[PDB]
Structures are given as C-alpha cells and as structure tokens.
Amino acid sequence: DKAPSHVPFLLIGGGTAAFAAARSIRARDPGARVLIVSEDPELPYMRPPLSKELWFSDDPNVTKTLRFKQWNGKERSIYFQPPSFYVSAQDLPHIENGGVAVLTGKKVVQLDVRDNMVKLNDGSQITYEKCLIATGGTPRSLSAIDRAGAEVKSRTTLFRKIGDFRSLEKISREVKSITIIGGGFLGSELACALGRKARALGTEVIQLFPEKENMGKILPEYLSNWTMEKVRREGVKVMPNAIVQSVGVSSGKLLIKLKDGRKVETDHIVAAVGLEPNVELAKTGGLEIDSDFGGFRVNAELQARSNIWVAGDAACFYDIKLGRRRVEHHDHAVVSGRLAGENMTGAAKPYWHQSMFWSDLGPDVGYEAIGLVDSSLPTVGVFAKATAQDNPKSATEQSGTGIRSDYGKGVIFYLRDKVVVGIVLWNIFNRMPIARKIIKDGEQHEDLNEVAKLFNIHE
C-alpha cells in the first residue's frame, strides 16, 4: 500500500488518540478522508489489556487471537476496529464518501509546517489540510541497563506493545525468574499478571522499585502499603527502596546489584519506569516543547499552530480549570483525540470534560482516579468495609465493559487551596461522574466525610 500525495486529514501516530480523532472527524464530516500514518505494523489497538485481561484468559490461543475476556467474561478484540473498518491509503482519494486509511510500518520523519507537508521514512511526501500529532511516548529504560552490554539489553523488555506482550508471555513459560523494575500502576499490574502465571507454572516473580511502597508517588501511605501487601500475596517478591547500581550477566543469569548492597539473580527484566513523549517532529516542525511537563505545548483547544493539533500522551495542554498538564491515560487519549477531531472540523472547543484513569490488580481490586493526583498534595481519605459488589469483576458485569473508560473501599480527596482538585476511588465503581462534578464545581467543602457519602461511604 502506497501513500497518496494529498489528504485532507493527516493523523501522525496510529494509537488510541489517533483512532479517537479519526472517529470524531468522520462523525462530524461523513465524507471525510482521513489518513493515519503509523510506524507500528499493527492497526490501532488499546493498550490496557496488555498488562491485565490478556494475562487472565484461560485460553492458550489468546496470544494469537488477541481476543481477551473482560472480568465479566464478555470477549473482545484488542483492536479498536477490525481491518474491514478501514480503506486502503492509495485508494483513499477516490473512494466515494471517503473513509479512514492506515499506512502501517511508516514513520513521519519530517514536518514542514509552512508547506503543510510531511515526509515519511521511505521518502514519500504527503500534503495535508489539517494535521494531528498523536505520537504518544517511548518507554524509558535505566542508565544502569543502558551501560550494561547488549546481552543485558536483549533480556530486558520495555513493556508497551503487542510484541512485548507476546515476547514476555513466551518468556513467562520458558524461564524460572522474572524481575519487574517499576512500582507504579503498570509495574504492579504486570507483577500481579506474572505472579498469577508463576503460581500455575511454579516459577518466580520479583518486583523492585525506589519508593517505599507500590504506587507511593500517587497513593497515600496507608493505601500504598495495603497495595504492596496485596501484590506480595499474589506471590511476588517485592523489594522496595531499591535503586539499581548495575546489571551484569553471570552463569547465564542476570545479576542486578542494588545501591544499598542487596543482589538479585533473575532470568529476564521487564522495565515499567515511565514514558518519554515522542517529540522528534518538533525539530523539523519548529514546534514548541514544554520544558516542565515534556511533550508538545498546545493550548486549551489542543492546537499548536493554525492547522496542527496534538492529542494523547504527547500533548502538554492548557486545562482552563486545573492549569497546564500532560496526561498519559487511555481515557485521556480517547477524550483528547475526540476533541482534536472536533476541532479539526471547526468546533473550537476547549478541553473541559476531565478524563479518568483506572487500574485493576486482577478482578478483585480496582482503582480509579481523576484530576490532579499526587501523594505530595494534601489528602483526606475516607474508607469503609467493601460489599460483594465493590470489585472490578462485579462492576464489569453491569456495563459490561472491562475498559472502565476491615476497610475494603474508599475515596481519597487531593486538595489545593482546600478545594478538591483530584480524587482516587479504591474499589468504588460507576461513580466517576460524581467525582467529575465535585472537581468541576470547585467548592470549599465544610466536611469531606459528607462528600464521601456521595460515593456511598458512610459511618
């Protein structure tokens, strides 16, 4: 499949934000011709199942089909749409009533804002009328792993894509011990996924990270400590306060040495230590990068320049209510991609509907979050005993979708000038609209125990 020479809507990157933008454009303009250029070989797909439900299938073909069961058992594909949804890129200009094409395996390597043109890595030039940059980010490694040999680098997975799921799943069945580096939500999800597999196969899983507890940069100490206990109980050797000094190879094994002197021998490493936004195009493009948050600096409408917008993990945007931010969440990619698509068809709307975050550690434990969430902010948490329905599985049986979008549950309010600017919900489902309204209203609350009643948390 070849690139057309001109396309009205050009979306750079073939992930969640681009897909959402394409759908939005087509809804606003039903004959739109939209080209997605994707360096990846895969059609657009959702990432969350890669660290969650794909690991909990009881089906040995899941690695081939990439159809997973949600916690409720409803089956679905990781792809947003099947191939039949798309048209060919070369035919895009001629198909009556347009369509969405994906040019896969192709990287945009130059942006020329003056001439409304991009150059691909094979040398093709495409002119556009409107352009969305939705390039997401690249997983970070550790300098310690960078300074190790090629052999250490070959046995380290920087977990992000379908191909990483497939390699790691195969590895999980071949080796004795896997070490996850990273204590955030992704690391902890992977630790639970691998912990589960290790129980059936009789293997080992280690999770190490610098913080005192799992998700300690986000959650208050009491819930981060509870979370660490939960991951341990999945049969994970959790090693907090761990800074990697060096990694080497010895007798076939990876040898990880910590600053504090502890040593881990393992067979493979998985890194989940965060993301670097993909801003290479800012150079040729003359586009501003945000030096505080990283990513492309765009306004409240996600606009960089007259006919260029940015969405998803790559966009540092102005939130009129909460201030300048950059967000790396699935629902944010959907919401921002959809908004950018509306704006590319003339809507001129600011980012207003707050996106949410969610994480599940198996079908029994879930977290949701919205707004400005950081364990350095002042927090007030209100907790209660969990009922039978306060878990991701029993929630998934209602919707029924796994893609969200004695204490066992609770709410945590994150405060700035004693207004709620962020909320985390622990095992409380189907209440994100209430959390969204609380943050939107921006009231000073006499009693956060009263607000907690809105989440069905009582005393």
Ligand X SMILES: Cc1cc2nc3c(=O)[nH]c(=O)nc-3n(C[C@H](O)[C@H](O)[C@H](O)COP(=O)(O)OP(=O)(O)OC[C@H]3O[C@@H](n4cnc5c(N)ncnc54)[C@H](O)[C@@H]3O)c2cc1C
- Is 55 part of any known ligand binding site? no
- Is 71 part of any known ligand binding site? yes
Alpha-carbon span 145 to 256, nearest angstrom: 10
CA separation (Å) from 391 to 179, 359, 360? 28, 12, 9
- Is 328 part of any known ligand binding site? yes
**Inter-helix orientation angle 185-201/162-174, to 10°:** 30
Least distance in angstroms from the C-beta of 134 to ligand X? 5
* Residues in touch with ligand X (CB under 6 A): 12-18, 37-40, 47-48, 50-51, 107-108, 134-137, 159-160, 186, 278, 281, 312-314, 328-331, 333, 357-359
**How many CB atoms neighbour CB 164 within 10 A?**
16
Least distance in angstroms from the C-beta of 284 to ligand X? 10
**Which residue's CB is nearer to ligand X, number 108 or number 452?**
108
How big is the CA angle at 182 (ends 176 and 185), to the nearest 5 degrees? 105
Least distance in angstroms from the C-beta of 37 to ligand X? 5
**Which residue's CB is nearer to ligand X, number 231 or number 384?**
231
**Which residue's CB is nearer to ligand X, number 134 or number 457?**
134
- Is 151 part of any known ligand binding site? no
Contacts of 409 (CB under 8 A, 6+ apart): 383, 384, 385, 386, 390, 426, 427, 428, 457
Least distance in angstroms from the C-beta of 53 to ligand X? 10
CA neighbor of 40 nearest in space, from 101, 86, 103, 105? 105
Q: Are strands 204-208 and 177-181 parallel, antiparallel or unpaired?
A: parallel
- Is 39 part of any known ligand binding site? yes
- Is 456 part of any known ligand binding site? no
- Is 204 part of any known ligand binding site? no
Alpha-carbon span 157 to 273, nearest angstrom: 11
- Is 443 part of any known ligand binding site? no
- Is 14 part of any known ligand binding site? yes
CA neighbor of 458 nearest in space, from 391, 387, 388, 382? 382
**Which residue's CB is nearer to ligand X, number 26 or number 329?**
329
Alpha-carbon span 29 to 115, nearest angstrom: 24
**Which residue's CB is nearer to ligand X, number 314 or number 457?**
314
Least distance in angstroms from the C-beta of 27 to ligand X? 18
Q: 135, 111 in Cβ contact below 8 A?
A: no
Least distance in angstroms from the C-beta of 152 to ligand X? 22
- Is 136 part of any known ligand binding site? no
**Which residue's CB is nearer to ligand X, number 198 or number 333?**
333
Least distance in angstroms from the C-beta of 87 to ligand X? 19
**Which residue's CB is nearer to ligand X, number 106 or number 452?**
106
**Which residue's CB is nearer to ligand X, number 302 or number 457?**
302
Least distance in angstroms from the C-beta of 182 to ligand X? 11
| Binding site feature residues for NAD(+) | 71, 183-186, 211, 217, 274, 328-329, 358, 368, 430
| Binding site feature residues for FAD | 13-17, 39-40, 47, 52, 108, 160, 313, 329-330, 358
| Binding site feature residues | 13-17, 39-40, 47, 52, 71, 108, 160, 183-186, 211, 217, 274, 313, 328-330, 358, 368, 430
